[model samples]
Target: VGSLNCIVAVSQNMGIGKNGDLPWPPLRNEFRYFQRMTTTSSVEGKQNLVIMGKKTWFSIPEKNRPLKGRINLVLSRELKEPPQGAHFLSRSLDDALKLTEQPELANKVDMVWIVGGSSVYKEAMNHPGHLKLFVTRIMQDFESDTFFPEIDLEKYKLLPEYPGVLSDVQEEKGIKYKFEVYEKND
Candidate 1:
């Protein structure tokens, strides 16, 4: 299986969303950080696999659906066909990861990215595989109902710095946030 990881932004209370929308205004730097981390591959000619829950997939605007360069994999059971721009559809996370092992794609996939909806993140957190958590800690609070599941510090230890990640705090529109990485300690 390919390396699996999550990339998400959270507020003080671990709030991640407000009714399916981001709670804070767009932070250009953070979005660029996301794009860079998810799109960059260590192996030439290999693409990363981004797996998202159905709701999360729908939250993205259609114009930006496939997200460019990387392969898009959306987990959905209700949809009869893959979404307009998604490259693959899976009923479960396991099935999605299996795609990376397929003969046709085994060498083409570099990593697996879990790009959210609470349940999906929770599931990925519990998976028995190498996992890295890339989080953007938003310094301010925002009104939100959706939350990132509580993480066990003992299970995922924080890293001081990670390759390709900017360690300093970034500010955009008065909002300050920092990039953080956590690796599964086990």
Candidate 2:
């Protein structure tokens, strides 16, 4: 029952971060796609999750740390507790994924989203079960310190289009990007 889906806004070269922040400006519309996709749950009375590494957790602005509606899980073995506003603290990617299936949480978690730093993205993509890659492919390259993990096309198939997912190319601040979804071949 592992959906193991991940969402990212990455550069043409697969770059995602620079200087501990986004390589590109946080374009407003690009943000809406990330926010809406992660926040919307298929069933009522349940919430989705955005799991990230420790640095990624703090990289967020102090006021906007918990990221609104989703269940925020921060990954760290060294940190004993969820820093201030995070919802859960996990030792590893598997530990956080495992938490979703526990008796206390199983009923409450509708979807799982693997947000990134670097390590968590790599590990989450390696999850053995089903996976969905929700990518916002930026058209230009930025000087990135890190990148989203590469998807094995032999395992994941890109879908032509998806319902409720915007398909048109978008441009803002002189940058253009588009949404692309890939599903596991199964």
Candidate 3:
């Protein structure tokens, strides 16, 4: 099985989205961090996979639908096949992980990034093996309906610092945030 990794930006209240959009203002570098993390891979001939819900897939602007430089897989039970520009279709979080292990994708898949909407994030967070979160902890509250599931501190520990990840608190458009990486102790 492949490792499960999540990337998200959460407000002080753990609110991630409102009405299918980010509740807070855009932080360019912060978002770029997500792009960079998911797109880059250490393996020379391998590319990473980004697994997102159908809503998350459509939420991206039509022009940027299939995020470049990575293989995109949309998790949907309703669709019979991968959406246009998407590489694969998975019915659930577990299904997506197993897809990466299949011979067709297993050798080429480097890392699996669980980019998601609310429900996908919630269930993927429960995955026990090598679960990691690349969260942008916003220092302000946006009061949104879509909240990230409460992280189990008992299983996750915040590392003091991470490579290529800024440790300094970032400020943009009057909002302060920091890029954090939490790894599962197990």
Q: Highest TM-score: give the candidate number.
A: 1
Which lDDT tens digits does candidate 3 get at residues 1-186? 245689999999989888778889778877788899988887888888999999888877777779999999999999999989998998888888877888999899888898878788888777556788998999998969788888888888898998889999899999999999999836
CA lDDT, candidate 2, residue 39: 86
Winner on lDDT between 2 and 3 is 3
TM-score of 1: 0.95
Tens digits of lDDT, candidate 2, 1-186: 336688889998889889888999879888877889988888888888889888888888887779888899999989989989999998988888788888978988888898787777777667676789899999998989898888899988999999878889999999999999998845
Q: Candidate 3 local accuracy as lDDT?
A: 0.86
Q: Which residue runs does candidate 2 get wrong by more than 4 Å?
A: none
Native-to-model Cα distance after best TM-score fit, residue 7 in candidate 1, in Å: 0.6
- Give the clashing pairs for model 1: none
Error of 2 at 103 (Å): 2.6
RMSD of each: 1.2, 1.4, 1.4
- Model 3, position 2: C-alpha lDDT score: 47
lDDT of each: 0.87, 0.85, 0.86
Which of 1 and 2 is ahead in TM-score? 1
lDDT of 1 at 100: 82
Tell me how many residue pairs clash in candidate 1: 0
